[PDB]
Amino acid sequence: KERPTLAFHASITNSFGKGSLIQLLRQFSQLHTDRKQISVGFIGYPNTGKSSIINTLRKKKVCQVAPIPG
Amino acid sequence: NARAKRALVKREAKLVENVKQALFIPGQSCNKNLHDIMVDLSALKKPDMKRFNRKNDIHPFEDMSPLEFFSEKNDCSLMVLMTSSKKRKNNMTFIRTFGYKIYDMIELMVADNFKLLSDFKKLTFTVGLKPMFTFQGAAFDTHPVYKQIKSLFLDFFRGESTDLQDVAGLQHVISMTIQGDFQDGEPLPNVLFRVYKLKSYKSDQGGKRLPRIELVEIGPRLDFKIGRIHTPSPDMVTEAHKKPKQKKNVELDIMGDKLGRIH
Amino acid sequence: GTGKKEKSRRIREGDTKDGNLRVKGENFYRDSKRVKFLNMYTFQDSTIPDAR
Amino acid sequence: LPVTVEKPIPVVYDLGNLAAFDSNVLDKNDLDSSNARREEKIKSLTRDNVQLLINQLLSLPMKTTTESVGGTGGQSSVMTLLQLPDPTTDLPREKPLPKAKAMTKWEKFAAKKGIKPKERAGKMIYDEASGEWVPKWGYKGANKKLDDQWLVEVIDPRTLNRAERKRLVKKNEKQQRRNMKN
RNA sequence: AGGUGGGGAGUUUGGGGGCGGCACAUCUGUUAAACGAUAAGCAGAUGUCCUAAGGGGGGCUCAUG
Numbered sequence: 125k126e127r128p129t130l131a132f133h134a135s136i137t138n139s140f141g142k143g144s145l146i147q148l149l150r151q152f153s154q155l156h157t158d159r160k161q162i163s164v165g166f167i168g169y170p171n172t173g174k175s176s177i178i179n180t181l182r183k184k185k186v187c188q189v190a191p192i193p194g
Numbered sequence: 195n196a197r198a199k200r201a202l203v204k205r206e207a208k209l210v211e212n213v214k215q216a217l218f219i220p221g222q223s224c225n226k227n228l229h230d231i232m233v234d235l236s237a238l239k240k241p242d243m244k245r246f247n248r249k250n251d252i253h254p255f256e257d258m259s260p261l262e263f264f265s266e267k268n269d270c271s272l273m274v275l276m277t278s279s280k281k282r283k284n285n286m287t288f289i290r291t292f293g294y295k296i297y298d299m300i301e302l303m304v305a306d307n308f309k310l311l312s313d314f315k316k317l318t319f320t321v322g323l324k325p326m327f328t329f330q331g332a333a334f335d336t337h338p339v340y341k342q343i344k345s346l347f348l349d350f351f352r353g354e355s356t357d358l359q360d361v362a363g364l365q366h367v368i369s370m371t372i373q374g375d376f377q378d379g380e381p382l383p384n385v386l387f388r389v390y391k392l393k394s395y396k397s398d399q400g401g402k403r404l405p406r407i408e409l410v411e412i413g414p415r416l417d418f419k420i421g422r423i424h425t426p427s428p429d430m431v432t433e434a435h436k437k438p439k440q441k442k443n444v445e446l447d448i449m450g451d452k453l454g455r456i457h
Numbered sequence: 458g459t460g461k462k463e464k465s466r467r468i469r470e471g472d473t474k475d476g477n478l479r480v481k482g483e484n485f486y487r488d489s490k491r492v493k494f495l496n497m498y499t500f501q502d503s504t505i506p507d508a509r
Numbered sequence: 510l511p512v513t514v515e516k517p518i519p520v521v522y523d524l525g526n527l528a529a530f531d532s533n534v535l536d537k538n539d540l541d542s543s544n545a546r547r548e549e550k551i552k553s554l555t556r557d558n559v560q561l562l563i564n565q566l567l568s569l570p571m572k573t574t575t576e577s578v579g580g581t582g583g584q585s586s587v588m589t590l591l592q593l594p595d596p597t598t599d600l601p602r603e604k605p606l607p608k609a610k611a612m613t614k615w616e617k618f619a620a621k622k623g624i625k626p627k628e629r630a631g632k633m634i635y636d637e638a639s640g641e642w643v644p645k646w647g648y649k650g651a652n653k654k655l656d657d658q659w660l661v662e663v664i665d666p667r668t669l670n671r672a673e674r675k676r677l678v679k680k681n682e683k684q685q686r687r688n689m690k691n
Numbered sequence: 692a693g694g695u696g697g698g699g700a701g702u703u704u705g706g707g708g709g710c711g712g713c714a715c716a717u718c719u720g721u722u723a724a725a726c727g728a729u730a731a732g733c734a735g736a737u738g739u740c741c742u743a744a745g746g747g748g749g750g751c752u753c754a755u756g
C-alpha cells in the first residue's frame with residue numbers, strides 16, 4: 125500500500141528476485157539520466173540481507189559475510 | 195537609429211509570427227468596382243492593411259519578381275493585386291510569399307451581382323476583432339484548389355492566434371459556401387462568400403444556457419470564380435510547415451511537482 | 458610510429474592549427490577533460506579580497 | 510425561436526481559430542445564383558452553422574481572475590472570458606526558422622576549454638584614489654580616466670591610448686567580419 | 692618500393708581566463724570624386740548631458756525665391 129515491496133532472496137548465486145531488483149534499479153537510473161551518478165544505501169537490522177544482498181547483486185562475494193551480526 | 199533597428203528586428207524571422215501583413219496593389223485596370231471591392235476587403239483587414247500609392251502594371255503570372263521585391267521592401271507576407279482583363283472580367287489575384295519568395299498564385303473574380311457594404315443594412319462593426327468562419331461542402335477539405343482557397347481565407351482573416359477570447363468579441367461571422375456539389379472532374383463551382391452579423395436572441399426556447407443565434411447579412415456579397423492557379427513545390431510546403439520544437443515517465447504534476455512512474 | 462606517434466594523429470585531426478591549447482598529457486586515452494579531472498587528486502593563497 | 514440544430518454528418522469544429530467545417534451535401538438546385546431563395550437558404554445554413562459553433566465554443570472553460578484593472582497589462586475580473594484550445598489547423602508559415610547561429614571561434618574554444626561563460630555580474634567595477642565605484646563601462650568609466658587624468662608620467666601619450674583603443678575596436682570589427690562568413 | 696615497426700634503445704615530464712567598448716555644434720594635413728560645392732574616415736586643445744538609446748509625453752516646421 126505504500127512501498128514497492130520487491131521480494132528478494134540473499135543467495136550468492138541462486139538468488140531469487142534479482143532480475144526484478146535489477147530492472148527497478150535500471151528504471152531508477154533511467155529516471156535520473158541527467159544526474160549521470162547515483163548510489164543506493166541499505167537500511168536494516170544486522171545480518172538480515174545487507175552484505176549477502178550486495179554480494180549476490182555483484183554475483184560474487186566481495187563484502188565479508190558470515191553468520192555474525194558484525 | 196534605434197527606430198530602424200526595431201523595424202529590422204520585426205523583418206527577421208520570429209519564432210512566433212504576428213498577424214500576416216497584407217499589401218494591396220491596384221493594377222493597370224483598377225476598375226471603380228475593383229476599387230470598391232478593394233475598399234471593402236480593406237475594411238475587413240484593418241488595421242493590418244496597406245494600399246499602394248497609385249496604379250501599377252505588374253502581371254504576377256508574367257512577372258513574379260516585382261511581387262517579391264514589393265514584399266521584401268514592405269515586409270508584407272500577403273499580397274493582393276486586382277486586375278481585370280477583357281476575357282477575365284472583374285478578375286482579382288491573391289498571392290502568398292514565403293521568405294519573400296512567391297508561394298502560390300490564385301485568380302479570383304467577382305460576379306456583377308455583388309452587393310457592396312453600403313448597399314446592405316447599416317450595422318455596428320469594430321475593426322481588429324477576429325471574426326468567425328464556417329465552411330460548407332466536402333470540397334473544402336476533399337479538393338486541392340478549395341483547400342488552398344480555405345487556407346488563404348483563414349490566413350487572411352484569422353487575425354491573431356490568442357488563446358483567450360472575449361464573449362462580446364464575436365460580432366460577425368463569415369459564411370464560406372460553394373455553388374453546389376460537383377462530380378469528379380467537373381468544373382469547380384464558384385465559391386460563395388458572405389458575411390453575417392450576429393444577433394443574440396433570448397434563450398426562451400433554449401432555456402438559459404444558450405441563446406437563439408440570429409444573423410443579419412451585411413456583405414460584401416461576392417461569388418469567386420476560379421481562374422489560373424499556381425501551387426508551391428513539396429519542399430516549400432514542408433518548409434512552411436516547420437515547427438519551433440518548443441520524456442519517458444516524466445510529467446509535470448499539478449503545482450509543478452516533477453513526478454514519475456516506477457512500473 | 459608511424460601511426461602510434463601523436464604528431465601524426467594531431468596532423469590528421471587538424472588540431473595542430475590550434476595547438477596553443479595543447480594540454481599536458483594530450484593522448485587518445487584520457488583526453489584533457491579527463492587529465493584535468495585526474496589532476497585534481499594531486500585554496501591557501503591567503504589573498505585579501507575587497508568584500509564591497 | 511427554437512435553438513435546436515442537427516445534421517446527419519457530424520460537424521467538424523476548429524475552436525482554436527473560431528472556425529468550423531460542414532461537409533454536408535450542398536443543394537445545387539437552390540444554390541444557383543439565379544434563384545431568389547438562394548439568399549434565404551444561405552442565411553439559414555449560416556445561422557445553423559453559427560449556432561452549432563457557438564454551442565460547441567461555449568462548452569470550453571472560462572477563466573475568472575480575482576484581480577482588478579491595476580496596470581495597463583491587467584485584466585478585469587468582471588469580464589468573463591472563454592479559454593480557447595490550441596490551434597488545430599496547420600496554416601503555412603511566412604518565413605523560415607532562423608535556427609542558424611554564429612559559429613565564431615570563441616564558442617569552439619570554450620567548448621574545448623574548461624572556461625565557463627561569464628556570469629555578467631554587473632557594470633560597477635571598483636577603482637582607487639576617487640572614493641567611488643567608477644563603473645568600467647557605461648558612464649565616464651575608467652577607459653577615459655587615463656585621458657582625463659592630468660599626469661601621464663612615463664610625443665603625446667594621451668592620444669596613444671585612444672589610438673590603441675580604436676585599433677582594438679577595429680580588430681574586434683575585423684574578427685566580426687571574419688566570423689560573418691561562417 | 693610501401694607498411695607494422697618502446698618488440699628495442701636515448702630523453703624529459705616547464706616556472707597562466709576571461710576583455711573591447713561614447714555621440715553629437717566645431718576647425719585643421721589626407722581623403723578631394725580635380726571649372727567646385729564639399730561629402731562618405733583617419734588624430735587632434737574642444738564639451739555635455741543623449742544616464743554611452745533618445746524611449747515616452749506636449750508643441751514647431753523645414754533648404755531656397
Ligand SMILES: [Mg+2]
Nearest residue numbers: 170171172193
Ligand atoms: Mg550482517
